[PDB]
Amino acid sequence: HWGYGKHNGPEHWHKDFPIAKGERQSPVDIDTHTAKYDPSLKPLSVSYDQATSLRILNNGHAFNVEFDDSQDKAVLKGGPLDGTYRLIQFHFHWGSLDGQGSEHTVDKKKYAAELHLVHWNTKYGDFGKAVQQPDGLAVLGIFLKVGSAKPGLQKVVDVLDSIKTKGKSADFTNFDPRGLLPESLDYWTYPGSLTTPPLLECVTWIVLKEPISVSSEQVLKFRKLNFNGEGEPEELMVDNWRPAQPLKNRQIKASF
Numbered sequence: 001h002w003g004y005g006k007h008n009g010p011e012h013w014h015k016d017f018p019i020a021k022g023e024r025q026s027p028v029d030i031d032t033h034t035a036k037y038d039p040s041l042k043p044l045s046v047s048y049d050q051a052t053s054l055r056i057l058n059n060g061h062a063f064n065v066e067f068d069d070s071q072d073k074a075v076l077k078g079g080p081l082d083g084t085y086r087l088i089q090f091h092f093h094w095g096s097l098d099g100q101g102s103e104h105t106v107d108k109k110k111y112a113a114e115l116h117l118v119h120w121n122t123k124y125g126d127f128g129k130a131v132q133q134p135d136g137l138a139v140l141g142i143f144l145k146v147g148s149a150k151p152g153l154q155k156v157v158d159v160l161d162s163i164k165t166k167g168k169s170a171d172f173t174n175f176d177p178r179g180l181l182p183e184s185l186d187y188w189t190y191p192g193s194l195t196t197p198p199l200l201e202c203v204t205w206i207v208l209k210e211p212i213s214v215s216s217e218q219v220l221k222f223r224k225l226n227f228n229g230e231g232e233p234e235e236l237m238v239d240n241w242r243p244a245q246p247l248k249n250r251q252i253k254a255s256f
């Protein structure tokens with residue numbers, strides 16, 4: 001049932017998922033003046049050279065580009081992370097207007113969209129067990145702004161036509177996630193959660209400072225996706241973002 005509508009949106013999620021009012025929920029606002037530079041942070045390492053994409057799926061909430069995570073290929077490590085985290089999927093959250101769409105905010109600024117690259121900690125064997133641990137997941141968050149087009153995003157954009165409605169999927173091999181990254185790997189990091197039900201508090205968040213630019217046209221095609229299933233009345237897939245949540249007893253560290 002959960003969604004982003006008036007009757008099933010983020011303000012309703014606590015009823016089925018009481019952790020929504022928890023101690024380390026995501027996303028959060030990033031107060032750049034309060035974040036502290038942490039010399040203890042080691043160099044971040046994003047190694048997506050051997051990434052193997054498999055499929056793209058419309059799950060009724062976003063679209064997921066899924067990877068083969070059966071062995072050590074696309075992995076995130078270093079920075080605040082202990083050990084190696086394996087890429088399982090990526091997805092976006094975006095708005096109905098360029099003025100909104102991101103989940104994390106920076107000094108209350110909302111970007112047009114936000115990319116989440118999801119990885120699980122290989123010490124726990126698989127995703128499922130990973131989401132039972134306080135350090136089971138690492139998510140690399142990247143902001144999207146509207147300006148020039150992102151060439152590495154365009155294969156994603158052109159397949160969306162084929163997964164318009166909930167439950168549809170298409171083959172999506174040989175997609176290179178390195179084309180979605182910005183030049184800089186400066187980031188903010190804090191302990192947090194999934195931004196969607198079940199909102200599990202297992203995530204080390206790594207939010208890149210430098211946004212990637214995407215074209216109006218590319219994000220506009222995102223907004224053509226549907227929340228509903230085929231043959232059902234059209235509910236455009238937009239504003240699938242959760243607003244910022246109480247920082248509570250947490251500190252945000254800067255790698256720069």
Ligand SMILES: O=C1NS(=O)(=O)c2ccccc21
Pocket residue numbers: 002003004005006008227228235
């Ligand atoms: O996320 C959603 N799921 S839904 O199709 O019930 C819906 C309707 C309107 C706005 C958002 C949403």
Ligand SMILES: O=C1NS(=O)(=O)c2ccccc21
Pocket residue numbers: 091116117118139193194195196
């Ligand atoms: O939608 C979500 N945004 S997130 O990156 O926190 C995440 C992690 C795992 C599964 C789903 C999702």
Ligand SMILES: [Hg+2]
Pocket residue numbers: 131132133134135136200201202203
């Ligand atoms: Hg957890």
Ligand SMILES: [Zn+2]
Pocket residue numbers: 091092093116195
């Ligand atoms: Zn997400």
